[PDB]
Amino acid sequence: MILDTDYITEDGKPVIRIFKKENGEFKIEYDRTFEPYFYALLKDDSAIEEVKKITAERHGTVVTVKRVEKVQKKFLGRPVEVWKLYFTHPQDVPAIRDKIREHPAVIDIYEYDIPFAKRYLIDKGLVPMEGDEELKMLAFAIATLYHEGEEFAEGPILMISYADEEGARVITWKNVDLPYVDVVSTEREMIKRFLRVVKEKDPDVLITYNGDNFDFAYLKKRCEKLGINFALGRDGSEPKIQRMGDRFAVEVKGRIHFDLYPVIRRTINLPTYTLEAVYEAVFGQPKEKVYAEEITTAWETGENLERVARYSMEDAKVTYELGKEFLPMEAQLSRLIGQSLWDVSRSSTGNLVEWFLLRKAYERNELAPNKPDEKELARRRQSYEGGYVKEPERGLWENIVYLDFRSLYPSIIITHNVSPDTLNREGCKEYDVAPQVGHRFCKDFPGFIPSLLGDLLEERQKIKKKMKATIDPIERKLLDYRQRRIKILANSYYGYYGYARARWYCKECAESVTAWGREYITMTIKEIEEKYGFKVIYSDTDGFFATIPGADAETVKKKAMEFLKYINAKLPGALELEYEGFYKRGFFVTKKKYAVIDEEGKITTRGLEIVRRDWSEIAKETQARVLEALLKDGDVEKAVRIVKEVTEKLSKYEVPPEKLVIHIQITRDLKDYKATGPHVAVAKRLAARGVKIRPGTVISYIVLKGSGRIGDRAIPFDEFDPTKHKYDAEYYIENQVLPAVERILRAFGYRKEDLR
DNA sequence: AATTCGCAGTTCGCG
DNA sequence: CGCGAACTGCGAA
């Protein structure tokens, strides 16, 4: 099993290192033969003698062009001829590529920005994370001494905790009477002891929660003060810290540093992303939080260090438990994309698709398009029409069926061969013509993207068949993860087409896809209304809710089945309308906001305040309780009673403040805000006392009595003291509870004042 | 750093 | 000095 690749430099030449885990044993394969290269396209071949002579400087060392070779590849499915330019060292290409491009005889250059080690995985057909290998895993966490107004890592680490399959332990340098605490005398001995534990356990994976941006940097700065060689790497090296523009990321060579924080943030939508919140969300059991002020107080008073140790022990143990949950999923993604678990677990959607496409393009001798420069990026910010959204017939409905397309956008890409290499390609026998926008797509041969999509959707079906017949539960679960990653990959091509930073950007493909989608969905609505008597209540992009007014449940279901038989004999290719479910009642609030209840009693809510992080729990919990009264019992008087009780509970100050918190994410540097909302105003108070407010930070505030602007009265919930602070019951009634229930109960005759 | 389509709370500036 | 626009955030698909 391949884990990662990198390269070192020996006597001026690059040496690829392949980190493997084969049959329980860690190994390093070296490859000294791979040469870095990019491609150039010339106005004329004789200019190759001119370009061969171009040189550059790499702080001191003079960079030349090692060797050139003419090659023939396809660019967008068309044959082209370029010059492959080899170099002795990978760091030669950034120092020289701009000089070769700026030549008047060089038209452009291609594949000039592929990192050497990832280039190696692609060119050599290697795939990380394949085969029967258990990785040994170890999670860890630190606890520090914090005082407000000090630099980063001015204060010592107090505890390093770790957990794996054999338990959890805490290393600390005061006496704590707990069986899982090991005591040493100094912070230096504690860090050294933790070095030894990692070197002794020799894990394949190190799991942190936000180690990319706190734990490793803290350890780095302490190890510098204390004079410690921080040698975590299997090759004896120190953690390698790398800037990914805004934040940081940390490699441990020979190991996989699995940081849960970017993984969880990309995988699940939660109101906050504290370790305690993530654990309760994934596992359903509470984790108590101990705050920095308590940790410092306990350390300097020496009182209640047991509580700090237990908190530290639990940090590692839930971090390990979350590692076990999410690592296999990310391993399959790494195996699917063809890049390291380290890389993919920190990659956006667009980067993931692109690395997939670069490997597939290599295997088909397709020269890759370039990322856009500034001129081209500007040109690319024209938008296009999206999915169809019917304005709903607002209110309460009985006996609803939801009908929709099985994978509308990938079905359109497959069926109509929507690809930039088929777009308006002249001289074919057969084309499909996108409605409204007019783009022609050749059908004589499968496009690059359509072919990959077809392969993907077919592999997913073989896996599902293989899961149902396989007898090995670990194989079945890995298979499950792989077909899930494939579904997500396949559903990413559409958005990638319209992504201006994409190498394979194609506004025409993307707007063709949505145009075909609007055609298919609206023709279907028209047919079910005019030929089958249905009333279509609401519809968004690829599906719609419908009923027969005044028909019983079993009529609606059967007439829907018949319509499906009718419409699917008219839908071309892979387009298929499916019976997704029957809902006994549904309430449609606005476009993109509704709730339905199925015959079993389960309620599904979309877009409503219930699903949002920036609404208080008391609002959400109250709206949810209203929706049960209506959907489940059809009981409007109960719904009104529920809201009357809640506004009174707030008015007499008996709602717990924990249900009053509002969560809003900071989305940028704070000086780039043109207008200061309440959450920006709280984040400015906090940042003015040394707390870091990078983008992605979730402000958790509560609104206090007094008045003026909401921002003048907002404080972090951590700062809320129920003996010097009174929350604004009028704000939570007039601006939170009633605004979420009013748009629903307006359908029965109630106004906000009948609800107080 | 996937897309467009959409709702709504806060704040501020203007007749 | 109420109101609309602007900014802002987070949803659906």
Domain at A240, CATH number? 3.30.420.10
Amino acid at A137: M
Give which of A244, A445, A448 is closest to A346, Cα–Cα. Answer: A244
- Which amino acid would we find at residue A541? T
- Planar angle of CA A506, A508, A513, nearest 5 degrees: 100
Relative to beta strand A205-208, strand A256-259 is parallel
Q: Are A478 and A511 in contact (CB under 8 A)?
A: no
* Number of helices (H), then strands (E), in chain A: 24, 29
- In order, the DSSP letters of A204-230 are SEEEESSIIIIIHHHHHHHHHHTT---
The size of chain A, in residues, is 756
Measured CA to CA, the distance from residue A564 to residue A576 in angstroms comes to 9
Q: Which nucleotide is nearest to A385 (CA to C1')?
A: B4
How far does the CA of A449 sit from the C1' of B7, in Å?
35
Strand order in the sheet with A543-547: A389-390, A535-540, A543-547, A395-405, A577-590, A593-598, A603-606
Cα A553 from Cα A597, distance rounded (Å) = 14
Q: How far is the CA of A675 from the C1' of B12 (A)?
A: 9
Give the Cα separation of A358 and A370 in Å (integer).
Answer: 11
- The SS3 call for residue A201 is helix
Q: Which residue is nearest to nucleotide C13 (CA to C1')?
A: A541
Neighbouring CB atoms inside 10 A of A667's CB total 12
Residues contacting residue A375 through CB under 8 Å, at least 6 positions apart: none
Q: Are A159 and A306 members of one domain?
A: yes
Q: Are residues A187 and A315 in the same domain?
A: yes
Beta bridge partners, A79, equal A74
Nearest in space to A329 (alpha carbons), one of A117, A122, A486: A486
The answer to whether A137 touches A207, Cβ cutoff 8 Å, is yes
One domain for residues A262 and A115:
no
Cα A440 to the center of its chain, rounded Å = 34
Residues A173 and A249 reside in one and the same domain: yes
> Which of A608, A621, A607, A614 is closest to A656 using CA atoms?
A621
Angle (CA) A125-A453-A266 rounded to 5° is 80
> What is the CB neighbour count within 10 angstroms for residue A35?
15
SS (H, E, C) A151-162: CCCCCCEEEEEE
Residue with tokens 């260090």: A305
Cα–Cα distance for residue pair A567/A524, rounded to 1 Å: 7
- Cα A257 to chain centroid, rounded: 18
Question: Would you say A93 and A54 are in contact if contact means Cβ atoms under 8 Å apart?
Answer: no
Give the CA-to-C1' distance from A754 to B15 in angstroms. Answer: 35
Angle A468-A473-A479 from CA coordinates, rounded to 5°: 60
**In this structure, are strands A137-144 and A61-63 parallel, antiparallel, or unpaired?**
unpaired
Q: What is the distance between the alpha carbons of residues A109 and A90, in angstroms, rounded to a whole number?
A: 16
Strands A535-540 and A389-390, bridge-based pairing: antiparallel
Distance measured from the CA of protein residue A30 to the C1' of nucleotide B2, in angstroms: 37
CA-to-CA distance for A216 and A692, rounded, in angstroms? 17
**φ and ψ at A338, to 5 degrees?**
75, 25
H or E segment to which residue A101 belongs = helix A92-101
For residue A652, give the nearest of A703, A726, A584, A718 by alpha carbon: A726
Return the number of other C-beta atoms located less than 10 Å from residue A628's C-beta: 17
3-class DSSP state of A603: strand
Q: What does the alpha-carbon distance between residue A630 and residue A446 come to, in Å, rounded to a whole number?
A: 51
**Measured distance CA(A192)–CA(A104) in Å, rounded:** 58
Residues A183 and A252 in one domain: yes
Closest residue by Cα to residue A418 from A447, A438, A383: A447
A569 touches strand B (CB under 7 A): no
Contact A680, A693 (CB under 8 A): no
Inter-helix orientation angle A738-745/A617-633, to 10° = 20
DSSP output for A626-642: HHHHHHHH--HHHHHHH
A666 strand-pairing partners: none
b/e map of A54-82 (b: 16 or more CB within 10 Å)?
bebeeeeeebebeebeeeebebbbeeeeb
For residue A597, the SS3 value is strand
- Strand C nucleotides in reach of protein CB atoms, 7 A cut-off: 6-13
Report resolution (Å) to 1 decimal: 2.7
Q: Cα dihedral sign for A195, A199, A203, A205?
A: positive
Residues A177, A279 within the same domain? yes
Return the number of other C-beta atoms located less than 10 Å from residue A318's C-beta.
25
| Alpha-carbon dihedral sign for residues A386, A390, A392, A398 | negative
CB atoms within 10 A of CB A544: 23
Residues 674-713 of A with CB under 7 A from strand C: 674-675, 677, 679-680, 698
Question: What is the distance in angstroms measured between the alpha-carbon CA of A453 and the sugar C1' of C13?
Answer: 19
Alpha helices in A417-472 (DSSP H): 448-469
Residue pair A560/A548 in contact (Cβ under 8 Å)? The answer is no
Q: Is A504 in contact with A371 (CB distance < 8 Å)? A: no
How far is residue A681's CA from residue A712's CA, in Å, rounded to a whole number?
8
Geometric angle at alpha carbon A637, from A636 and A638, rounded to 5°:
90
The three-state secondary structure class of A194 is: helix
- Return the CATH number at A49: 3.30.342.10
Q: What's the CA gap between A289 and A304, in Å, rounded? A: 14
- Sequence-ordered alpha helix ranges (H) in A491-576: 493-497, 507-530, 553-568
CA distances from A496 to A111, A119, A446 (A): 19, 22, 19
Q: Between the CA of residue A670 and those of A213, A246, A619, A666, what are the distances in Å?
A: 19, 14, 28, 8
Amino acid present at A195: L
Contact A660, A737 (CB under 8 A): no
- For chain A, the helix, strand and coil percentages under 3-state DSSP, each to the nearest 5: 40, 25, 35
Which of A 368-407 have CB under 7 A of nucleic chain C?
Answer: 387, 404
Q: How far is residue A36's CA from residue A114's CA, in Å, rounded to a whole number?
A: 9
Which nt has its C1' nearest the CA of A539?
A: C13
Query: Looking at the structure, do residues A99 and A213 belong to the same domain, yes or no?
Result: no
Task: Identify whether residues A23 and A101 lie together within a single domain.
Answer: yes
Residue A382 burial (CB < 10 Å; 0-12/13-18/19+)? exposed
Residues 6+ apart with CB under 8 A from A325: A282
Q: How far is the CA of A654 from the C1' of C12 (A)?
A: 35
Burial of A716 (0-12, 13-18, 19+ CB in 10 A): middle
- The span from the CA of A258 to the CA of A255, in Å, is 9
Tokens of A149: 């107004």
Q: Map residue A174 onto helix, strand or coil.
A: coil
Query: What is the Cα Rg of chain A in Å?
Result: 30
Q: Which of A707, A710, A711, A721 minimizes the C-alpha distance to A682?
A: A711
Do A206 and A84 belong together in one domain? no
Phi, psi of A695 (to 5 degrees): -55, 150
A428: left (phi over 0), alpha (psi -120 to 50) or beta: beta
Say how many Å lie between the first and final Cα of chain A, rounded.
64
Based on the number of CB atoms within 10 Å of its own CB, is A717 exposed (0-12), middle (13-18) or buried (19 or more)?
middle
SS3 A423: strand
Q: Is the CB of A570 under 7 A from strand B?
A: no
Identify whether residues A178 and A304 lie together within a single domain.
yes
A400: closest CA among A535, A216, A202, A237?
A535
Residues A39 and A264: their CA atoms lie apart, in Å, by 38
> Which residues from 367-396 of A have any strand B atom under 7 Å from their CB?
383-387, 389
Query: Distance (Å, rounded) from C-alpha A405 to C-alpha A342?
Result: 36
Tell me the CA–C1' distance in angstroms for A612 and B6: 14
- The owner of tokens 């279907």 is A524
Q: Are residues A334 and A204 both part of a single domain?
A: yes
Distance CA A520, CA A523 (A): 5
Instruction: Determine the structural domain holding residue A69 and report its residue range.
Output: 2-124
How many Å does it take to go from CA A647 to C1' B11? 26
Which residues 571-600 in chain A have a CB closer than 7 A to strand C? 592-593
At A104, the amino acid letter reads: P
Across A505-536, b (16+ Cβ under 10 Å) vs e yields bbbbbbbbbbbbbbebbeebbeebeeeeebbb
- Cβ-in-10-Å burial (0-12, 13-18, 19+) of A281 comes to middle
* Residue A575 token pair: 């387009």
One domain for residues A29 and A93 = yes
Q: To which residue do tokens 């001289």 refer? A: A427
- Give, for A39, the enclosing helix (H) or strand (E): strand A37-42
Q: Measuring from the CA of residue A731 to each C1' atom, give the nucleotide at the shortest distance.
A: B9
**Burial class of A537 by CB neighbour count within 10 A (0 to 12, 13 to 18, 19+):** buried
DSSP state for residue A735 in the 8-state scheme: I
Do A341 and A256 touch, CB atoms closer than 8 A?
A: yes
